[PDB]
Design an enzyme around this catalytic site. Structure first.
Site, short mmCIF file in Angstrom:
data_model
loop_
_atom_site.label_atom_id
_atom_site.label_comp_id
_atom_site.label_asym_id
_atom_site.label_seq_id
_atom_site.Cartn_x
_atom_site.Cartn_y
_atom_site.Cartn_z
N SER A 266 -12.03 -32.26 -31.20
CA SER A 266 -11.04 -31.20 -31.18
C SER A 266 -10.82 -30.70 -29.75
CB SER A 266 -11.45 -30.05 -32.10
OG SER A 266 -12.58 -29.38 -31.59
N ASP B 53 -9.40 -27.27 -27.21
CA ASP B 53 -9.09 -25.86 -27.03
C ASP B 53 -7.83 -25.71 -26.19
OD1 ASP B 53 -11.43 -25.54 -28.36
OD2 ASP B 53 -12.61 -24.88 -26.63
N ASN C 108 -9.07 -23.23 -30.91
CA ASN C 108 -9.51 -24.58 -31.34
C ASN C 108 -8.57 -25.27 -32.34
OD1 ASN C 108 -11.12 -26.84 -31.39
ND2 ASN C 108 -12.87 -25.87 -32.37
N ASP D 192 -16.64 -32.90 -30.78
CA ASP D 192 -16.26 -33.38 -32.10
C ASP D 192 -14.85 -33.96 -32.14
OD1 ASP D 192 -14.82 -31.02 -31.82
OD2 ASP D 192 -15.04 -30.47 -33.93
N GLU E 286 -12.51 -17.73 -20.31
CA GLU E 286 -12.12 -18.88 -21.12
C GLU E 286 -11.13 -19.78 -20.38
OE1 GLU E 286 -13.13 -20.03 -23.97
OE2 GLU E 286 -14.26 -18.40 -24.91
N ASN F 15 -13.41 -30.92 -27.02
CA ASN F 15 -14.73 -30.68 -27.60
C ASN F 15 -15.37 -31.99 -28.05
OD1 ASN F 15 -14.38 -27.77 -27.35
ND2 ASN F 15 -13.11 -27.88 -29.19
#
Length: 129
Positions: A50, A52, A59, A48, A35, A46
């Site tokens: 958002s 990380d 998130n 949308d 990750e 992301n």
């Protein structure tokens, strides 16, 4: 801060992640490897809107507040920047609540695609625990 492999395993063990909800320590080290490459300052955006955050890439849609994800919740009750500290306590505590919400570590896409079903034990082999 960029952790060493055995360094992060020892840090996660002290914070109670070894066999937390049935997941051996090799699973958490494997998820953090893929990750974030063991880097606490990792961020990724992301599609949308958002983002990380942190060594486990938590998130902003559900778990933390960064002030730019409209419509999201803050179920870990923290600012997303606290997940970038060199002290992994905040990211560990938030991860405990995530893995408990029913779906296990499947919430981490990299664990599902690159650690699930493998010999995760080898990620802690050779370390002093």
């Amino acid at each position: 801060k960029v952790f060493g492999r055995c360094e992060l395993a020892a840090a996660m063990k002290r914070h109670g992640l070894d066999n937390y909800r049935g997941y051996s320590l090799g699973n958490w080290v494997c998820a953090a490897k893929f990750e974030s490459n063991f880097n606490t300052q990792a961020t990724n955006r992301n599609t949308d809107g958002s983002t990380d955050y942190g060594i486990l890439q938590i998130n902003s849609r559900w778990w933390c507040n960064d002030g730019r994800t409209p419509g999201s919740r803050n179920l870990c009750n923290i600012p997303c920047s606290a997940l970038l500290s060199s002290d992994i306590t905040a990211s560990v505590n938030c991860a405990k609540k995530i893995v408990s919400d029913g779906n296990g570590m499947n919430a981490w896409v990299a664990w599902r695609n690159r650690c699930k079903g493998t010999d995760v034990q080898a990620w802690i082999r050779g370390c002093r625990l």
